[PDB]
Amino acid sequence: LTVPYDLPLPGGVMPRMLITIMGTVKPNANRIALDFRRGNDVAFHFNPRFNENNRRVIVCNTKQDNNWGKEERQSAFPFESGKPFKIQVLVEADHFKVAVNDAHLLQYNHRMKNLREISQLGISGDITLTSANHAMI
Ligand SMILES: OC[C@H]1O[C@@H](S[C@@H]2O[C@H](CO)[C@H](O)[C@H](n3cc(-c4cccc(F)c4)nn3)[C@H]2O)[C@H](O)[C@@H](n2cc(-c3cccc(F)c3)nn2)[C@H]1O
C-alpha cells in the first residue's frame, strides 16, 4: 500500500471496532504516525519516534483547530528498524486500546468523544504497509 495511506472510515468508529495495521518498519526509521482524523482535527495521533534526543518514545495527542494538546508519552517501545509490526487499535467507549505484536501497549482516553465523525485513518512515516483492516469484535 502506498504510504502515506488514508484508510476510509465512512461509518466512523465505535466501541468494539478493532483496527489492524500490518507492515515492516524501514531501515534507519525516524518516525511512524497513525492519525484518526475528524475533518481537519486529529482525534488520536499515535506517533512512535525512533530518535528524539537519542531516545525512543511513543507520543500520543489530539489536534483541535490546528493546535496540539498535551502529549501523552510512553517509553515502552516495541518497534525496531527493518522489522515487521502489527499495530492493533481497539475502540472502547472511554478510550482507544493499542497493542503491538500481540502485546497491549497503551490506552488513550478519548478527548474528542463524537466517534461517528472520525472519518479516516492516516498511516504515515517510515514503513512498508501491507494491510489496514477493521472488524467488530
Ligand atoms: O504533539 C504531537 C505533535 O508533535 C509535533 S513535534 C512537538 O513540537 C512542539 C513544539 O513546541 C514541542 O517541542 C513538542 N514537545 C516535545 C517534548 C518533549 C518532552 C519530553 C522529552 C522530549 F525529548 C521532548 N515536549 N513537547 C514536540 O513533540 C509534531 O510535529 C506533530 N506531527 C508529527 C507528524 C508526522 C507526519 C508524518 C509522519 C509522521 F510520523 C509524523 N505530523 N505532525 C505531532 O507529532
The rounded distance, in Å, linking the Cα atoms of 58 and 52 is: 10
Instruction: Check the annotation: does 82 bind a ligand.
Output: no
Domain that holds residue 95: 1-137
User: Ligand 1: distance of its center to the CA of 59 in Å?
Assistant: 7
Alpha-carbon gap, residue 89 to 107, rounded angstroms: 9
Number of domains in the chain: 1
Query: What is the CB < 6 Å shell around ligand 1?
Result: 31-33, 45, 47, 52-53, 59, 61, 68, 71, 124-125
Distance CA 87, CA 80 (A): 13
Do 15 and 128 contact (CB within 8 A), yes or no? Answer: no
Angle at 131 between CA 36 and CA 117, to 5 degrees: 25
Distance CA 75, CA 41 (A): 26
Is residue 69 a known part of a binding site?
Answer: yes
Work out the number of other CB atoms within 10 angstroms of the CB of residue 13.
Answer: 22
Number of H helices, E strands in the chain: 0, 12
Rounded distance from Cα 9 to ligand 1 centre (Å) = 25
Q: Which of 71, 72, 111 to mutate to test the pocket of ligand 1 (most atoms within 8 A of CB)?
A: 71
To what resolution in angstroms was this structure determined? 1.4
Are 4 and 124 in contact by the 8 Å Cβ rule? The answer is: yes
Cα 11 to Cα 21, 22, 57, 118, distances in angstroms = 18, 22, 32, 8
Residue closest via CA to ligand 1's atom 10 equals 68
> Grid coordinates standing for 105?
501497549
Q: Give CA 115 to chain center in angstroms.
A: 15
